[PDB]
Design a protein around this ligand. Structure first.
Ligand code: NA
Ligand code: NA
Lengths: 162, 162
């Protein structure tokens, strides 16, 4: 049976946090963070559902200083649903949303070992004939001593319209 | 010597995360989250510094659906600097920022056991003669099973201008 796509709600916050946590690899925010996103940012976020389980999430916001830029924060797809095109469908759903009107750039950061995200963003640009630019973003050394976190290179997609 | 107040930067992200973590009580987001706030949201955030240490932080954003409302996310003051008026000075600094122009409401959520925040927001409204309204916000049951998190009642301050 099919995968369903919708805007999240504050009450999804806990299941979103579970998804992110079960991924193992991703930077995990507080459950409250996911509720706020469900509440205040849900016009520019996306959930994927299959047989009533959350199997995908994208969080994004429009940059407050430069609202023509959408920043994509997290992309998560459950293990059990890899390689079925879900990340690509979320991102495409998201850019179709009415709250993405007037956006001319996508901006995001992709960790070295996140190869799905690298593929998603480069492929999105390539399939739509939009420029993509990759530069130094945040360095590993900006992260706290206890952990060992990777670099977060910056990806800018565009200009385009909408 | 005095406490200094400024907008944060992406490179403060790690020290902000340390402050939040050392507080013990607060919902801790990922270091990356604090960097994004330093980067994309810093016009509506605030740092407090004393003898080059971070001793206070406020995070906020303008609601994307209702940009006349500022939502205040986290308020943190280091243990060692309680009861010296820092939270009040941050919040007052923040509302003076040029990116708070045209704001007519403050909205936030305060946990039951966070008595400093309760005092800050109720006192801010009372000192400025602005209405304050308190209602049910997020319930404890919306949080994940493993933890035991409290309610987050909603505080709305206003209308006012600016
Ligand atoms: Na354009
Ligand atoms: Na007003």
């Amino acid at each position: 049976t099919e995968v369903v796509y919708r805007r999240p709600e504050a009450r999804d916050g806990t299941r979103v946090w579970e998804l992110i946590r079960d991924t193992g690899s991703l930077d995990l925010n507080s459950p409250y963070c996911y509720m706020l996103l469900g509440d205040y940012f849900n016009d520019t976020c996306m959930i994927a559902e299959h047989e009533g389980d959350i199997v995908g999430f994208i969080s994004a916001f429009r940059s407050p200083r430069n609202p023509e830029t959408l920043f994509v924060w997290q992309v998560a797809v459950a293990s059990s649903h890899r390689r079925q095109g879900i990340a690509k469908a979320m991102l495409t759903g998201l850019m179709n949303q009415k709250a993405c009107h007037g956006v001319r750039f996508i901006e995001t950061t992709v960790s070295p070992s996140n190869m799905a995200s690298r593929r998603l963003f480069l492929g999105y640009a390539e399939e739509k004939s939009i420029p993509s630019t990759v530069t130094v973003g945040y360095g590993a050394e900006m992260f706290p001593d206890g952990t060992t976190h990777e670099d977060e290179p910056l990806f800018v997609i565009g200009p385009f319209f909408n």
